[PDB]
Structure 1
Amino acid sequence: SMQEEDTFRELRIFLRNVTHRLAIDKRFRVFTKPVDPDEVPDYVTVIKQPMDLSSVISKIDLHKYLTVKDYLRDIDLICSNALEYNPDRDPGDRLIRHRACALRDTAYAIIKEELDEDFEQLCEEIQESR
């Protein structure tokens, strides 16, 4: 319905705003764009589903997220990709893992404080009805 489309539009506005705040945080610069295969040629064979904050914006605009739960699956994917690709004790790996966990924790904290739980419940019930 039209009222439901208004709900999903508000969801998209909210998600663009959260995503922008993550993307401008200097800690998360490494997550802002797709990984370049020239810099790390082994990435596409290890990481089966690359994800990054620019791709998240593209998916918002393609209406791929109908709930914040589905949005957070892609944030979690950015983080789990980083943990999987950087598992070693080396400081370069440990820095990226720390940033990845900070990205996840920051996204979840913004949503816990700013997402109304009845709004999310409404999105989930619309999604379930289709």
Structure 2
Amino acid sequence: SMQEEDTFRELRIFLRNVTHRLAIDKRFRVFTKPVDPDEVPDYVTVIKQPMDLSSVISKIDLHKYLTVKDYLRDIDLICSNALEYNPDRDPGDRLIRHRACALRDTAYAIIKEELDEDFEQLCEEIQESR
């Protein structure tokens, strides 16, 4: 129905806004674009599902997210990829992991405060009906 398509449009608006706010945060610069093959050639061999905030924006616009839970799976993937690829004790790896955790925690915190649970449940129920 048109009411359902309006629901998903509002969802995309909400997701674009959250993603923007993450993408403009200086801490999260490393997560705004794909890892560059030239600089890190073993990346695509170790990490089987690369993800980044630019790809998330593209996915929003392609209607790939019909719930906030589906969006959060890709925010979680950005974070888990960073933890997996950079697991060592040195300061460069520890910094990226701290930033990855902050990206995840920040996204969840924005969503906890600004997503209406009945809106999410509506999206879930429409998604399940398809």
TM class, shorter-length = over 0.9
What are the Cα deviations for residues 24-82 of structure 1, in whole angstroms up to 9, with x where unaligned?
A: 00000000001101111110000000000000000000000000000000000000000
- CA distance in structure 2 between the partners assigned to 1:99 and 1:58 by the alignment: 22
**Residues in 2 aligned to 1:39 and 1:123: alpha-carbon distance in whole angstroms:** 40
CA distance in 2, matches of 1:30, 1:66: 26
1:74-89 superposed matches below 5 A: 74-89=74-89
TM-score where L is the length of structure 1: 1.00
Aligned length: 130
Deviations 1:77-125 (A, max 9, x none): 0000000000000100000000000000000000000000000000000
User: When the two structures are superposed, what TM-score results if normalisation uses the length of structure 2?
Assistant: 1.00
Q: Distance in 2 between matches of 1:77 and 1:17?
A: 19
Match of 1:72 in 2: 72
Which 4+ residue blocks in structure 1 deviate beyond 6 angstroms? none
Distance, in Å, in 2 between the alignment partners of 1:55 and 1:63 is 13
Distance in 2 (CA, whole Å) between partners of 1:65 and 1:26 is 26
Unmatched segments (≥5 aa) in structure 1: none
Identity fraction in percent: 100
Paired with 2:54 and 2:41, the residues of 1 have a C-alpha distance of: 21
| CA RMSD after TM alignment | 0.3
Distance in structure 1 (CA, Å) of the matches to 2:8 and 2:61: 11
Partner SS for 1:19: helix
Q: Find the aligned partners of 1:70 and 1:103 in 2 and give their Cα distance.
A: 16
- Deviation per CA, 1:1-22, whole angstroms, max 9, x where unpaired? 1100000000000000000000
